[PDB]
mmCIF file of C-alpha atoms and ligand atoms in Angstrom:
data_model
loop_
_atom_site.group_PDB
_atom_site.id
_atom_site.type_symbol
_atom_site.label_atom_id
_atom_site.label_comp_id
_atom_site.label_asym_id
_atom_site.label_seq_id
_atom_site.Cartn_x
_atom_site.Cartn_y
_atom_site.Cartn_z
ATOM 1 C CA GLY A 1 -7.316 14.346 24.332
ATOM 2 C CA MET A 2 -6.302 14.152 20.690
ATOM 3 C CA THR A 3 -3.396 12.852 18.639
ATOM 4 C CA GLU A 4 -2.036 14.188 15.355
ATOM 5 C CA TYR A 5 -0.577 11.821 12.729
ATOM 6 C CA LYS A 6 1.544 12.706 9.688
ATOM 7 C CA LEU A 7 0.727 10.240 6.891
ATOM 8 C CA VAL A 8 2.328 10.047 3.445
ATOM 9 C CA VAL A 9 0.736 8.300 0.458
ATOM 10 C CA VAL A 10 3.198 7.039 -2.163
ATOM 11 C CA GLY A 11 3.026 4.881 -5.276
ATOM 12 C CA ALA A 12 3.140 5.199 -9.057
ATOM 13 C CA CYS A 13 1.160 7.606 -11.184
ATOM 14 C CA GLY A 14 -2.477 6.652 -11.536
ATOM 15 C CA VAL A 15 -2.723 4.043 -8.757
ATOM 16 C CA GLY A 16 -5.344 6.103 -6.885
ATOM 17 C CA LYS A 17 -3.373 8.042 -4.258
ATOM 18 C CA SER A 18 -5.480 11.184 -4.661
ATOM 19 C CA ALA A 19 -8.752 9.237 -4.960
ATOM 20 C CA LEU A 20 -7.985 7.328 -1.752
ATOM 21 C CA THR A 21 -7.037 10.537 0.081
ATOM 22 C CA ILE A 22 -10.173 12.350 -1.107
ATOM 23 C CA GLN A 23 -12.334 9.397 -0.029
ATOM 24 C CA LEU A 24 -10.843 9.770 3.461
ATOM 25 C CA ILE A 25 -11.091 13.574 3.699
ATOM 26 C CA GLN A 26 -14.414 14.096 1.815
ATOM 27 C CA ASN A 27 -16.185 10.726 1.799
ATOM 28 C CA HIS A 28 -16.781 10.367 -1.935
ATOM 29 C CA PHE A 29 -15.060 9.265 -5.149
ATOM 30 C CA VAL A 30 -13.391 11.943 -7.246
ATOM 31 C CA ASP A 31 -12.346 10.318 -10.525
ATOM 32 C CA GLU A 32 -10.365 13.219 -12.037
ATOM 33 C CA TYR A 33 -7.684 14.999 -10.011
ATOM 34 C CA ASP A 34 -4.683 16.871 -11.434
ATOM 35 C CA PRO A 35 -1.659 14.491 -11.287
ATOM 36 C CA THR A 36 0.611 17.524 -10.765
ATOM 37 C CA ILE A 37 -1.156 18.605 -7.546
ATOM 38 C CA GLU A 38 0.830 17.550 -4.483
ATOM 39 C CA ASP A 39 -0.467 18.777 -1.132
ATOM 40 C CA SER A 40 -1.253 17.881 2.467
ATOM 41 C CA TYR A 41 -4.899 17.444 3.513
ATOM 42 C CA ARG A 42 -6.121 17.539 7.101
ATOM 43 C CA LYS A 43 -9.067 15.551 8.412
ATOM 44 C CA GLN A 44 -10.316 15.024 11.942
ATOM 45 C CA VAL A 45 -11.723 11.547 12.597
ATOM 46 C CA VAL A 46 -12.268 9.267 15.614
ATOM 47 C CA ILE A 47 -10.207 6.066 15.817
ATOM 48 C CA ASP A 48 -10.870 3.567 18.618
ATOM 49 C CA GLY A 49 -12.550 6.313 20.664
ATOM 50 C CA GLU A 50 -9.796 8.956 20.333
ATOM 51 C CA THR A 51 -10.023 12.117 18.260
ATOM 52 C CA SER A 52 -7.356 11.827 15.593
ATOM 53 C CA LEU A 53 -6.090 14.547 13.264
ATOM 54 C CA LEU A 54 -4.684 12.990 10.075
ATOM 55 C CA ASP A 55 -2.407 15.234 8.007
ATOM 56 C CA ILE A 56 -2.178 13.298 4.754
ATOM 57 C CA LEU A 57 0.484 14.151 2.186
ATOM 58 C CA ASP A 58 -0.674 13.015 -1.244
ATOM 59 C CA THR A 59 2.522 12.826 -3.321
ATOM 60 C CA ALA A 60 2.316 13.906 -6.956
ATOM 61 C CA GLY A 61 3.984 15.776 -9.806
ATOM 62 C CA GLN A 62 7.425 14.954 -11.050
ATOM 63 C CA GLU A 63 9.158 11.737 -10.236
ATOM 64 C CA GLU A 64 12.536 13.303 -9.508
ATOM 65 C CA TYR A 65 14.851 12.935 -6.523
ATOM 66 C CA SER A 66 14.737 16.049 -4.361
ATOM 67 C CA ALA A 67 15.741 17.055 -0.838
ATOM 68 C CA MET A 68 12.210 18.425 -0.318
ATOM 69 C CA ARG A 69 10.785 14.921 -0.844
ATOM 70 C CA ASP A 70 13.316 13.447 1.603
ATOM 71 C CA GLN A 71 12.006 15.941 4.174
ATOM 72 C CA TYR A 72 8.405 14.747 3.535
ATOM 73 C CA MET A 73 9.469 11.223 4.476
ATOM 74 C CA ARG A 74 11.530 12.388 7.453
ATOM 75 C CA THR A 75 8.523 14.329 8.814
ATOM 76 C CA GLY A 76 6.084 11.543 7.874
ATOM 77 C CA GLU A 77 5.235 9.039 10.611
ATOM 78 C CA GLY A 78 3.528 6.392 8.461
ATOM 79 C CA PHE A 79 3.344 5.509 4.781
ATOM 80 C CA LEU A 80 0.751 3.950 2.491
ATOM 81 C CA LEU A 81 2.547 2.068 -0.272
ATOM 82 C CA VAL A 82 -0.119 2.063 -2.971
ATOM 83 C CA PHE A 83 -0.254 -0.028 -6.146
ATOM 84 C CA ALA A 84 -3.154 -0.852 -8.469
ATOM 85 C CA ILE A 85 -4.153 -4.517 -8.735
ATOM 86 C CA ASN A 86 -4.539 -4.185 -12.534
ATOM 87 C CA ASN A 87 -1.055 -2.622 -12.910
ATOM 88 C CA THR A 88 1.917 -4.995 -12.501
ATOM 89 C CA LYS A 89 4.451 -2.168 -13.014
ATOM 90 C CA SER A 90 3.042 -0.223 -10.037
ATOM 91 C CA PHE A 91 3.439 -3.365 -7.885
ATOM 92 C CA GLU A 92 7.018 -3.856 -9.111
ATOM 93 C CA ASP A 93 7.719 -0.232 -8.054
ATOM 94 C CA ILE A 94 6.663 -0.831 -4.410
ATOM 95 C CA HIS A 95 10.143 -2.126 -3.567
ATOM 96 C CA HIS A 96 11.689 1.152 -4.716
ATOM 97 C CA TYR A 97 9.224 3.271 -2.719
ATOM 98 C CA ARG A 98 9.995 1.265 0.438
ATOM 99 C CA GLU A 99 13.758 1.423 -0.194
ATOM 100 C CA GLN A 100 13.628 5.193 -0.582
ATOM 101 C CA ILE A 101 11.592 5.657 2.614
ATOM 102 C CA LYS A 102 13.937 3.337 4.500
ATOM 103 C CA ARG A 103 16.936 5.320 3.177
ATOM 104 C CA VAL A 104 15.607 8.591 4.619
ATOM 105 C CA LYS A 105 14.364 7.175 7.940
ATOM 106 C CA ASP A 106 17.562 5.106 8.422
ATOM 107 C CA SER A 107 15.479 2.234 9.790
ATOM 108 C CA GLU A 108 13.783 -1.005 8.828
ATOM 109 C CA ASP A 109 11.099 -0.352 11.464
ATOM 110 C CA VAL A 110 8.905 2.268 9.787
ATOM 111 C CA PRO A 111 5.086 2.228 9.988
ATOM 112 C CA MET A 112 3.729 1.207 6.563
ATOM 113 C CA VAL A 113 0.710 -0.478 5.015
ATOM 114 C CA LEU A 114 0.751 -2.081 1.577
ATOM 115 C CA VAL A 115 -2.387 -0.998 -0.301
ATOM 116 C CA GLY A 116 -3.696 -2.811 -3.371
ATOM 117 C CA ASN A 117 -6.156 -0.323 -4.869
ATOM 118 C CA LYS A 118 -8.820 -0.651 -7.598
ATOM 119 C CA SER A 119 -10.127 -3.879 -6.048
ATOM 120 C CA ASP A 120 -13.461 -3.247 -7.811
ATOM 121 C CA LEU A 121 -11.941 -3.867 -11.268
ATOM 122 C CA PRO A 122 -12.569 -7.315 -12.817
ATOM 123 C CA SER A 123 -9.292 -7.732 -14.751
ATOM 124 C CA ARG A 124 -6.538 -7.974 -12.129
ATOM 125 C CA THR A 125 -2.910 -8.733 -13.011
ATOM 126 C CA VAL A 126 -1.216 -8.695 -9.578
ATOM 127 C CA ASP A 127 -2.232 -11.737 -7.567
ATOM 128 C CA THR A 128 -3.230 -11.445 -3.971
ATOM 129 C CA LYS A 129 -0.595 -14.006 -2.885
ATOM 130 C CA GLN A 130 2.190 -11.956 -4.443
ATOM 131 C CA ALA A 131 1.093 -8.890 -2.470
ATOM 132 C CA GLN A 132 0.483 -10.887 0.733
ATOM 133 C CA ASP A 133 3.963 -12.433 0.479
ATOM 134 C CA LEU A 134 5.622 -9.059 -0.151
ATOM 135 C CA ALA A 135 3.863 -7.529 2.859
ATOM 136 C CA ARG A 136 4.966 -10.534 4.936
ATOM 137 C CA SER A 137 8.624 -10.045 3.939
ATOM 138 C CA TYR A 138 8.331 -6.386 4.969
ATOM 139 C CA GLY A 139 6.501 -7.224 8.218
ATOM 140 C CA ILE A 140 3.590 -4.886 7.420
ATOM 141 C CA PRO A 141 -0.171 -5.237 6.865
ATOM 142 C CA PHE A 142 -1.679 -5.652 3.383
ATOM 143 C CA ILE A 143 -5.141 -4.222 2.680
ATOM 144 C CA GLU A 144 -7.114 -4.287 -0.569
ATOM 145 C CA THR A 145 -9.025 -1.077 -1.296
ATOM 146 C CA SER A 146 -11.341 0.538 -3.797
ATOM 147 C CA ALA A 147 -11.405 4.341 -3.781
ATOM 148 C CA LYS A 148 -14.383 3.968 -6.149
ATOM 149 C CA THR A 149 -16.621 1.945 -3.792
ATOM 150 C CA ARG A 150 -14.792 3.013 -0.600
ATOM 151 C CA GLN A 151 -14.176 -0.669 0.305
ATOM 152 C CA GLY A 152 -11.211 -0.930 2.703
ATOM 153 C CA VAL A 153 -10.394 2.808 2.658
ATOM 154 C CA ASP A 154 -10.972 3.556 6.347
ATOM 155 C CA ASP A 155 -9.328 0.209 7.185
ATOM 156 C CA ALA A 156 -6.178 1.189 5.241
ATOM 157 C CA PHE A 157 -5.784 4.590 6.916
ATOM 158 C CA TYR A 158 -6.865 3.514 10.416
ATOM 159 C CA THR A 159 -4.632 0.433 10.302
ATOM 160 C CA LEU A 160 -1.719 2.723 9.453
ATOM 161 C CA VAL A 161 -2.568 4.942 12.434
ATOM 162 C CA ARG A 162 -2.632 1.836 14.649
ATOM 163 C CA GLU A 163 0.818 0.874 13.295
ATOM 164 C CA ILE A 164 2.098 4.370 14.137
ATOM 165 C CA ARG A 165 0.704 4.067 17.691
ATOM 166 C CA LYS A 166 2.635 0.821 18.198
ATOM 167 C CA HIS A 167 5.869 2.316 16.881
ATOM 168 C CA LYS A 168 5.535 5.354 19.156
ATOM 169 C CA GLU A 169 5.344 3.064 22.213
ATOM 170 C CA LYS A 170 8.854 1.770 21.602
HETATM 171 C C1 U4L B 201 1.463 10.857 -11.922
HETATM 172 C C2 U4L B 201 2.088 11.644 -10.773
HETATM 173 C C3 U4L B 201 2.255 10.979 -9.401
HETATM 174 O O1 U4L B 201 1.248 10.715 -8.746
HETATM 175 N N1 U4L B 201 3.471 10.672 -8.969
HETATM 176 C C4 U4L B 201 3.945 10.066 -7.706
HETATM 177 C C5 U4L B 201 5.342 10.560 -8.072
HETATM 178 C C6 U4L B 201 5.800 11.811 -7.301
HETATM 179 C C7 U4L B 201 6.467 11.175 -6.072
HETATM 180 N N2 U4L B 201 7.090 9.941 -6.584
HETATM 181 C C8 U4L B 201 8.205 9.369 -6.080
HETATM 182 N N3 U4L B 201 8.775 8.414 -6.832
HETATM 183 C C9 U4L B 201 9.904 7.780 -6.463
HETATM 184 N N4 U4L B 201 10.384 6.826 -7.268
HETATM 185 C C10 U4L B 201 11.597 6.036 -7.012
HETATM 186 C C11 U4L B 201 11.354 4.726 -7.768
HETATM 187 C C12 U4L B 201 10.304 5.017 -8.848
HETATM 188 C C13 U4L B 201 9.685 6.366 -8.477
HETATM 189 N N5 U4L B 201 10.503 8.088 -5.299
HETATM 190 C C14 U4L B 201 9.993 9.025 -4.476
HETATM 191 C C15 U4L B 201 10.681 9.317 -3.285
HETATM 192 C C16 U4L B 201 10.478 8.612 -2.098
HETATM 193 C C17 U4L B 201 9.456 7.477 -2.050
HETATM 194 C C18 U4L B 201 11.201 8.941 -0.950
HETATM 195 C C19 U4L B 201 12.141 9.971 -0.966
HETATM 196 C C20 U4L B 201 12.349 10.679 -2.149
HETATM 197 N N6 U4L B 201 13.157 11.685 -2.480
HETATM 198 N N7 U4L B 201 12.995 11.989 -3.670
HETATM 199 C C21 U4L B 201 12.065 11.198 -4.221
HETATM 200 C C22 U4L B 201 11.630 10.353 -3.289
HETATM 201 C C23 U4L B 201 8.822 9.700 -4.854
HETATM 202 C C24 U4L B 201 8.329 10.687 -3.944
HETATM 203 N N8 U4L B 201 7.943 11.468 -3.210
HETATM 204 C C25 U4L B 201 6.421 9.485 -7.828
HETATM 205 C C26 U4L B 201 4.849 10.814 -9.500
HETATM 206 N N1 GDP B 202 -12.088 1.657 -10.825
HETATM 207 C C1 GDP B 202 -11.317 2.380 -9.974
HETATM 208 N N2 GDP B 202 -10.676 3.477 -10.455
HETATM 209 C C2 GDP B 202 -9.898 4.228 -9.641
HETATM 210 C C3 GDP B 202 -9.754 3.850 -8.234
HETATM 211 N N3 GDP B 202 -8.939 4.755 -7.670
HETATM 212 C C4 GDP B 202 -8.584 5.642 -8.629
HETATM 213 N N4 GDP B 202 -9.173 5.327 -9.798
HETATM 214 C C5 GDP B 202 -9.010 6.021 -11.091
HETATM 215 O O1 GDP B 202 -7.630 5.898 -11.454
HETATM 216 C C6 GDP B 202 -7.155 7.106 -12.043
HETATM 217 C C7 GDP B 202 -6.016 7.653 -11.202
HETATM 218 O O2 GDP B 202 -6.489 8.043 -9.905
HETATM 219 P P1 GDP B 202 -5.680 9.160 -9.091
HETATM 220 O O3 GDP B 202 -6.337 9.294 -7.747
HETATM 221 O O4 GDP B 202 -5.501 10.372 -9.967
HETATM 222 O O5 GDP B 202 -4.254 8.419 -8.904
HETATM 223 P P2 GDP B 202 -2.873 9.108 -8.432
HETATM 224 O O6 GDP B 202 -2.190 9.543 -9.707
HETATM 225 O O7 GDP B 202 -2.154 7.955 -7.751
HETATM 226 O O8 GDP B 202 -3.285 10.206 -7.493
HETATM 227 C C8 GDP B 202 -8.355 8.036 -12.117
HETATM 228 O O9 GDP B 202 -8.940 7.927 -13.421
HETATM 229 C C9 GDP B 202 -9.302 7.507 -11.054
HETATM 230 O O10 GDP B 202 -10.681 7.765 -11.328
HETATM 231 C C10 GDP B 202 -10.486 2.650 -7.785
HETATM 232 O O11 GDP B 202 -10.409 2.265 -6.599
HETATM 233 N N5 GDP B 202 -11.222 1.983 -8.686
HETATM 234 MG MG1 MG B 203 -2.724 12.296 -7.569
#
């Protein structure tokens, strides 16, 4: 059979949400993508032997509270919390993204993966320990990715699917 998964990618402007999503859906690096374009993108893959349809919402546009965005999170089954390793502000924001998702879901048990993107860049500002410790406090996996080289990209998305599978068994 097959399983469908609703994924939502969140994080600050410019962390690589679209680039990561496009690497998953199209298998190459797209370095310029309109920051106002928010959409869902479907991609059929195979994960641990089962056909899996990933509907991936790539959040974008205006950072503004809206009921429409609350509905995205309510519908969403798992969330990539993305920051850039060379952007301390985007890492600081992760807390707020998690808090907002937790608010909507009304739960502390929500499938999430912390993603540190732009791992290819030489000048990092957010240390791995800081991210590892934050993920530990949340009880979620941490995966370093590069949308540029594709390092860790499948691992990030597939790990999130595996976290959703576990949650669904409860
Ligand atoms: C450069 C453009 C870009 O890629 N952006 C990502 C957004 C659009 C969606 N964003 C967003 N931001 C926030 N913030 C709260 C703390 C700092 C920014 N919250 C939400 C959000 C969440 C995570 C959950 C529920 C929400 N309801 N309204 C907003 C909600 C989103 C979203 N989506 C930044 C700019
Ligand atoms: N070096 C590097 N650049 C990246 C990576 N991911 C995204 N970028 C670049 O970062 C900028 C923002 O990427 P984008 O996908 O638009 O981020 P979004 O605003 O979160 O969707 C663009 O100039 C991308 O080319 C990465 O893994 N490595
Ligand atoms: Mg984008």
